[PDB]
């Protein structure tokens, strides 16, 4: 045991693979954020007495999130940092890598435990995205594609939507996206604050 479950990466990015600027996101999309909350939060139903999803994130993403929203509620938060800091505080959870995080989670949230783990999401940092992309259990990318090359200075590390990666990563039908996420999701382009964007789900075989 340690690799029972696959990982899912969730990310909002520009057609240039832009994901961030200054330790923020150079867009403010309140319906996007709300999709993120619903996806990372949703647990199939018979399960939802025991079950919680996990969000894994890098230190600077943790720092990036406005203090009033940390830890992300109704999810198990784990911050991944090669320098066991710290910063705690409210109950929460550090590991020096993706695999140390998974080991900590499996130790902490066992069959015995009152809380059980449902799905595990990597929610960013560029650096943790790169670790997740290299991990043999990552098989799923929930991507919000922002159709505007907004200036960014932090980039998603692998062009998964590009021709070079297209025998590995496949974009799924929208009905399958709605299935996975268990609700209606808007199809096609959405316009908030002068940006068109759309939700995609991509997968690869393990
Ligand atoms: C600065 O990154 C923020 C900033 C604020 C924020 O607010 C959550 C609380 C809230 C609730 C209700 C309204 C407003 C705020 C969450 C994030 C992380 C985020 C956002 N979209 C995200 N979207 C995608 N596609 N992927 C992510 N990984 C992601 C991630 C990590």
Bind-site residues for substrate? 32-37, 75
- Domain 1-206 falls in which CATH fold? Dihydrofolate Reductase, subunit A (3.40.430)
Instruction: At 189, give phi and psi (nearest 5°).
Output: -75, 140
What contacts 24+ positions apart, CB below 8 Å, involve 183-189?
Answer: 183/38, 183/42, 185/35, 189/147
Q: Distances from the Cα of 169 to the Cαs of 33, 109, 166, in angstroms?
A: 24, 31, 5
Candidate from 9, 23, 31, 33 with most ligand 1 atoms within 8 A of CB, to mutate: 33
User: Residue 29: CB within 6 Å of ligand 1?
Assistant: no
Q: What is the dihedral of CA 44, 181, 54, 205, to 10 degrees?
A: 110
Q: Which residue, 36, 44, 179, 58, is CA-closest to 118?
A: 44
Give the span between the Cα atoms of 192 and 116, in whole angstroms: 36
Strands 76-80 and 51-58: parallel
Q: Whose CA is nearest to atom 27 of ligand 1?
A: 11
Resolution of the determined structure in angstroms stands at 2.0
């Amino acid at each position: 045991m340690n690799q029972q479950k696959s990982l899912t990466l969730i990310v909002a990015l520009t057609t240039s693979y832009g994901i961030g600027r200054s330790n923020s996101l150079p867009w403010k999309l309140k319906k996007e954020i709300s999709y993120f909350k619903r996806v990372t939060s949703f647990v199939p139903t018979f399960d939802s007495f025991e079950s919680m999803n996990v969000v894994l994130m890098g230190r600077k993403t943790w720092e990036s999130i406005p203090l009033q929203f940390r830890p992300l509620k109704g999810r198990i938060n784990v911050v991944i940092t090669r320098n066991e800091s710290l910063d705690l505080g409210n109950g929460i959870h550090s590991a020096k890598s993706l695999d140390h995080a998974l080991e900590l989670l499996y130790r902490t949230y066992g069959s015995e435990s009152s809380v059980q783990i449902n799905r595990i999401f990597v929610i960013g940092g560029a650096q943790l995205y790169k670790a997740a992309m290299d991990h043999p259990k990552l098989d799923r990318i929930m991507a919000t594609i922002i159709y505007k090359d907004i200036h960014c200075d932090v980039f998603f590390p692998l062009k998964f939507r590009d021709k070079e990666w297209s025998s590995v990563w496949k974009k799924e039908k929208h009905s399958d996206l709605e299935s996975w996420v268990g609700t209606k999701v808007p199809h096609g382009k959405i316009n908030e604050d002068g940006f068109d964007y759309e939700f995609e789900m991509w997968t690869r075989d393990l």
